[PDB]
């Protein structure tokens, strides 16, 4: 689901891709994302991620 997104002032101002482990899916594109913010800032229409080691 469309969980906590960076959609605010300090947009995906987080690169350090070496920590998080979200579970994002988009119609038919399910993959994990570290920079969950980079997703929220650079997603199509609101990537569907679910924070947690599920993917």
Query: Could you tell me if 11 and 37 are in contact, meaning their C-beta atoms sit under 8 angstroms apart?
Result: yes
CA 38 and chain centroid, separation: 7
Query: Could you tell me if 21 and 34 are in contact, meaning their C-beta atoms sit under 8 angstroms apart?
Result: yes
Q: Taking the CA atoms of 27, 32, 37 and 41 in sequence, report the sign of the dihedral they define.
A: negative
CATH 3.30.60.30 holds for 1-55: yes
CA 38/CA 32 separation, integer angstroms: 12
Experimental approach taken: NMR
């Amino acid at each position: 689901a469309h969980m906590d997104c960076t959609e605010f002032n300090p947009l995906c101002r987080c690169n350090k891709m070496l920590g998080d482990l979200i579970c994002a899916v988009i119609g038919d594109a399910k993959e994990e994302h570290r920079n969950m913010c980079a997703l929220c800032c650079e997603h199509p229409g609101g990537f569907e991620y679910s924070n947690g080691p599920c993917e």
